[model samples]
Target chain A: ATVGKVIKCKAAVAWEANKPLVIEEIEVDVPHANEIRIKIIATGVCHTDLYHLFEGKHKDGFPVVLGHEGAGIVESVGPGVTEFQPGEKVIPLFISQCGECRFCQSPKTNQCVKGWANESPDVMSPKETRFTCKGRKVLQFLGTSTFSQYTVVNQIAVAKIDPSAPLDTVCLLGCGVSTGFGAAVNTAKVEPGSTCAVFGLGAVGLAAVMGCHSAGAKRIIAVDLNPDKFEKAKVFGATDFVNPNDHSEPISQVLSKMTNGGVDFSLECVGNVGVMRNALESCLKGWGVSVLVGWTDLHDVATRPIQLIAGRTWKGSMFGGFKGKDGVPKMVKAYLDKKVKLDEFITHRMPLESVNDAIDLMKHGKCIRTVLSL
Target chain B: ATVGKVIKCKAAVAWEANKPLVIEEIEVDVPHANEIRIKIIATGVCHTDLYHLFEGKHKDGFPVVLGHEGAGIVESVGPGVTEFQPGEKVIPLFISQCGECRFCQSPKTNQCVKGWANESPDVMSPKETRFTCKGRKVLQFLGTSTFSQYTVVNQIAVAKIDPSAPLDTVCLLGCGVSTGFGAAVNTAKVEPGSTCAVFGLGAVGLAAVMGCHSAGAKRIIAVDLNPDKFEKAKVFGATDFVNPNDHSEPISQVLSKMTNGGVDFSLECVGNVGVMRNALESCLKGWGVSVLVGWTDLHDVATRPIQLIAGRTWKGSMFGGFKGKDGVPKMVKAYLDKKVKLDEFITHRMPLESVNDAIDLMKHGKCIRTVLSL
Candidate 1:
């Protein structure tokens, strides 16, 4: 064991909007109590990351880390942290929930309080630098920003898993897979023998299709402009596919006809407000619930009152309402058991130095999820 | 047992929209098997009756008997009808569900199979009409039309009650009261120590306030334009009141501030789309459910999907999801046991001859509920 070890690590830092993510060397602080320091093995590049990169909504400038969805090894635990020792495999969770809060206890994991204070990349409390560049305070993405070679996080931010599971592929489950899967299984609670209409066939939508399959829903209708994505969705349990380009009929009408009234659930993975509206309106009149897994402009749209009286619902899901302690392990176990196909969703893998290229591939719809191997 | 007896009754019938109701002689037919002919002692006038009369929503044409909320006695039971004989006190139900259908067995009773055929006003089915004028079918409004001296209905339509209760006061519970009370206690399931907001102050809203009191809601906020109704709402359960006269601020803001961040549940008793929007938006985020009890025109308003995504629910409730056999009896018992005030909402009483005047009183906001004595 090395005391006061100084290990230089590489990270992809977003310096500016529409600019390349630069790889840089950074120093890691020694693990503190209730904290674990992880050596990043693989990290999945997600739309959220790309959005922040180009949109600059998350103003964690060039020097700040950009990735949050990752799987790694517990290189070491700080004082009094006994959950995992060096070499234990884990998936990093951006959300840190205090399980004792009213929201955490009530089955809503997204509203958990543990890491709420550190949601933005720009600010952490009044003035506390969780991350630094050349000894100056730099913004951190979510609590578990994992683009770097080594990152330190609280115990609640990592779910320890079997070391035998493949690290590079399993990283996708940390974000996109969990989000898409949980939208259908948890938020929508798609019942057995029901039908679902999923909007968008990116990694998240495909994962939702898989989730609907696991939940025993008989029909999964994939609706998207990209006809090529249908085959991928079909492999994940989409029983039917709708190409908006080929279909002239309204999406709701087509969906209603396909499901014998309307689908039992509609999963909106596209952030477009119009697509969100169609997703909600396409659900069954009496029983359907639509879950919004995509992020959009906060002020772009608001649902009207009449739509509500018609017996439809639209709800949000964040990181698939990831329960860092319990859910991530189950996901990892599922991956290990081959009950899920996370590898199929991973379309590209690049070294940490090529983070900007990976992000570009994701932005152009070239990859389902681009992984950064450190 | 007066087998050949012919009862001549005085009844009020709507001949046309904007025309006065006619007080005329009508002949009551003998009851049939499993049917009881009730001598209507009192009938609560509701807005729905006016809607049927002037709006012609129910196209029964001129001379249609119009009344739904009432209490009466079994003047006579038809042959083989063993549930009640002569002079048994009862409250008439608008819907008499058999309680054997998939819908009835499920949480939804409004879509019950046994009562689905109630669309016909002739009531010639299980619970048919005993009143006729000029050998033509006098349409029954909602199967009970209790404005006549004698009304015949199915055994499932009448629930026997303690005769000691005031028939006139208890009649109010037959419709408006039940709809409102049930909306709060059953539809919204107002939680203990939670906040509730009501959107109207007519019979249904007032009853909902009372129901909220029974449901242990700590804060009951009544939203109405008239400042005068605030005192009455407080008497029932309203802990706070908002006069929307100053509609400058978003109703949501006003309500959220009043309840320290929105009520747990809201009931829309006013059918106006704006009021409906207000009620739905003025509920707490994540846990609030807004139930629309008022009937709006089809396509009157449109709801956007964003509201539901914020963890708020918008649903419609009819008769407060009342299953007659299961809920009506319990409601009657509650009223009879003095657990709730049913008569406090009744503001006027008139004879069958003054039905038009009673409706006028409602139109001008001079009354909450009016009971017409037959």
Candidate 2:
């Protein structure tokens, strides 16, 4: 399986759509120019991986390695890799931060021009893939196929984190945690003393609650149909709890009634389009900002234009609006300084071979995040 | 019909839906405690009046006096009306500026608490209307019914303007011009040097083009189905013109291609829901801001949630985000100083008796705005 100086590794590969990933040996190619090979140490199990695995909305072809929220050590660097070096602690970014790109240069957006274009699934340069399973090429999901013991990534898509920060917990910052936290602080820009409502109570939702709390939001109302998550929600500083199933009226109206109008900010951490609509509708008439933090590809969001016409704003965030290379290291520093919480998010710790168990737990709503140790 | 001290006046009243206004003698009641009676001088004909007349989506009942964009002289002040005095030059507002209401106090919105309750079509308060045609009470369209030679309005809904400023030209600021300009300046806050796209080449679209120009936009692309409006659009500072009929591709894709990625700002000045969708989709990813300036109640706007999730923002603006009592005077001053263009927008002038001709001109797209001399 050796091609020049390529290495061999073990990875959980999804041989087909709507099936559990199989733990199998694969060959890892050496990184090309502007690429770096990373030895994944700890990774987080997120809903995105499960979505492509079971939802049958596979954009990248099957027989793919699926995992994106990850932290690792740089094992080797290819030509022109100047920002990162071997033995450096880093987080693998799904959203790239090529400093020369127009998006990276603009302060308004985090999308990089040279990154994995989510809009074009099959156009990520055929030579970008590094993993191969049983002599067949393997597709990388969301650019960072961290389900493997070792993976190669473009140098621009890696954030060199603080050396002292523990990779195990900071791995959550790779996607879910950073996404939710930044959705509030960066995207919604939750002002102090303002009220906020967070839809969903998963890892991302809990992180949003933390973000609102840290941002000094006066009232953080956590909503979820599962009342069981309420207790965990409070630990992240949620002041109110609402179960949409318990209310006869639409959750938005209930939220409006409770807040004496509506919340100043709302975050939709649930990827369901219906909940996203509810979250948007729950914002106050004037100066209300609603941010969609969850990822969904299937359904389109619909609303009467009058909602926005009456002074409400609708926006969304990806990777919490964090410029991958620049923002992640600061997050790692925040974690090291204890300004951000990550320990609570990891509800389960499992070995690399037990990824299927992590997926099952997430599907059953029994876990916030399951950190996999490679 | 003189109960106590009411006055009789001439007004063009709509007897029923889909019928042209019939000039008739109507009884005008004295201003109530917080109302002021105005001597109508000039009013601008807008699309909203025609929408109800032709579309039959009448919010206010039949036998109504229609016209919200008007300039007039304050004939008399009510018992408790302190803001206005006799012989004051003023403009009537459909959206009130109650300075005391929470909405009025908040800088984020201009929607006053005492304004027309759009949600309750028939409940504008029995005392709010002061007109009676042939003793069969007449409804006021919006809060200001300028179709009458004499109309009564709440003090909060009257903006006192400069005495020397011509009422005919500044009357355009009462609705269309102000709404479009303010949507760009206040709502979307179009930054200098940014590229912008304005959908539709009506007065609102042209004003949006001017707003983008005044905001120092480097490139202003005016879009419309009719190429005939391109000449007028260029006079209002449109740097480029696009006719949707000339392109085989969807308008959004055409715009995105012309602007490299997409416009930084887009204004949907067309009330058509389809155009609104196109305008929003034409905005650049990341920091594009789209403002819906046209008024429509029939259709809901739909788009993929990914549109917003990828960084585009959707917003709507009413009355250009200007506080009526405070902003109208400054706009009048701007007009007096020749900072705002109004003469170019007045394509026709006629007596109040020829109001039907003005409506016909508007329906046929033969005029931008026809000023009626009351």
Candidate 3:
């Protein structure tokens, strides 16, 4: 048994910013108290991993293992870990829900201080990261290094799923799908018969469309600059498609004209700040709600205070407003029950060595998801 | 009786921007169908009037009769007006609740297309304005030109209030007080045991503090550049006072430090966009709610997208989310029942002829409110 011993595992190691990851043998230390070591079986490549890798805002974040959305089997548990046991199927959550924290105790928010983006947003936890390579310790990205063959995470960051749940499909729930879907369902609170517009046609945006449809939205307009994404969006229940490049006017004004003032709810899955503004402006005055589901730290998002003053709301969602522990499992069950769509999200499948190919496909807007089997 | 005939009345007319209002005798037209004419009893001089007078952003807005926060008794009703009769005490609403528009039908917002802010935000109604100065039509400011001794308003813009309510005191509910009070009570939905911060210690900010306390907020922090307003804020249930000038760090950082993380709810009653940023940053992540209560259109408000993505909500309230017809009357009754404060909001009293003196007192922050006796 590999309990209490150092495990040498194959991991995609990022040595520096703007550089591709290299497959390397890294040493993963045994789980500490309240931690669990997971044998990551399958991980889904997400844009957020690409953002941190190429954007490279964090100075000391290099030489790290990057992956937050992954499903795995519990290899071992730390001394104080009670939430999971060896051989249990689980999903590593980017947003952790520690039942002990005030945020977790409250029903209002899904954020927890125990999660990855707690105090230092971009940097990994100093205590929880167990990977080391080339005489230097590698940082853990978002506290869940699913790019590696094995990774260790805090007990709070681990969600135990049903054994019947597919590691490849349910892993989608670990980040993008949950983030996008919840942006509409939970954050925007899309009502029955409400008209909704979702910008961006990535997996997240598509998931938002599905969520809107699931909520009985009368109209789900999928917006993007690319025309190719429209067909994919229709499969996800988008009732209408809009190409911003095709319109002479601003996308928001176009949307307002289409929906007679504006959509009841608007979601921005594109991380661009300009898109965020357009998403807010796409909402009708009085009771329209707009949610920002995409992640960006490069520039500030801005809008006239009147947009809000006119009785519209601007909200943001993290992990789809899903409390990882409770929400992830429910999503897995939903996926298993055929209520949540997951199979359609995976556009490619490749070995762990093909991670760069997955990233490239995402960057080129050619793939919705690439499940990398370890 | 002024039932079927135009009346000559003394009104404050803004002949041009950046200049003081001049008292002049103007002809007030009779109420049209579904309209009511009211004899102005008392009106409060609000900063909004000054914003339109001095800010002067709107073109062709000169020679206007301004004043929206006023109480009066119905002198006559036009044909087909069933909502009001002669001698009925009422408050003029800048925001109308037609109860027929999509916004009014929806429970989510108090805004209506029939309101002053519908279709055109700053422009008054072209058809409903009935004030005429020497050889020209004086634009009815906000469709409720209570700056005149007698004014005609759409029945939808008039709220019938309790007969016992004092016109001078309850007139405060017409705008500022209701805007601030509902920004917390309704817009932010300040919860019990929540910590709240109100920026700018004007009537609206103080009303926010009062609303927070009314909602069972445990701690209310009053913030303003002027420390003199802090003493008055205490009466409205401000447990702490903060002057941004006293802190070396940003006011937001100071607040976060003071409140352990940040306040649960924040209200920006100061219309400055810079202050809007500070108010948003002053809220804690994971379900913090920040509301913009002050009106500003000069510049855009900007914020780091991560501030929202971390689980904070940015909202704006119009007339404090009060549905004019139903909400204004309840506020009036609340004041009459002694649950709402009005007397303390009035710091000075003067005749309509001394309106410029009232404006001067407001500009200098010398008075909370100046009641102009019509």
**How high is each candidate's TM-score?**
0.82, 0.96, 0.97
lDDT of each: 0.74, 0.86, 0.88
Off by over 4 Å in 2: A1-4, A122-127, B1-5, B55-60, B118-127
Please give the TM-score that candidate 2 achieves against the real structure. Answer: 0.96
Give the per-residue lDDT of model 3 (tens digit) for B77-152: 9999887899989999887878887788987888777755654565554445688888798888888888899988
- Pick the DockQ winner: 3
- Look at candidate 1 and tell me the lDDT of residue A371: 79
Q: What is the interface RMSD of each candidate, in Å?
A: 4.2, 1.2, 0.8
lDDT value, residue A349 of candidate 3:
96
Clashing pairs in 2: B179-B320
B266-361 in candidate 2: lDDT tens per residue?
999988789888898999999998999986877778888788988999999888999988989998998888888999999899999998999899
lDDT of 3 at A59: 78
Q: RMSD in angstroms, all models?
A: 4.9, 2.3, 1.7
Indicate the residue-level lDDT of B198 in model 1: 90
Interface RMSD of 1: 4.2
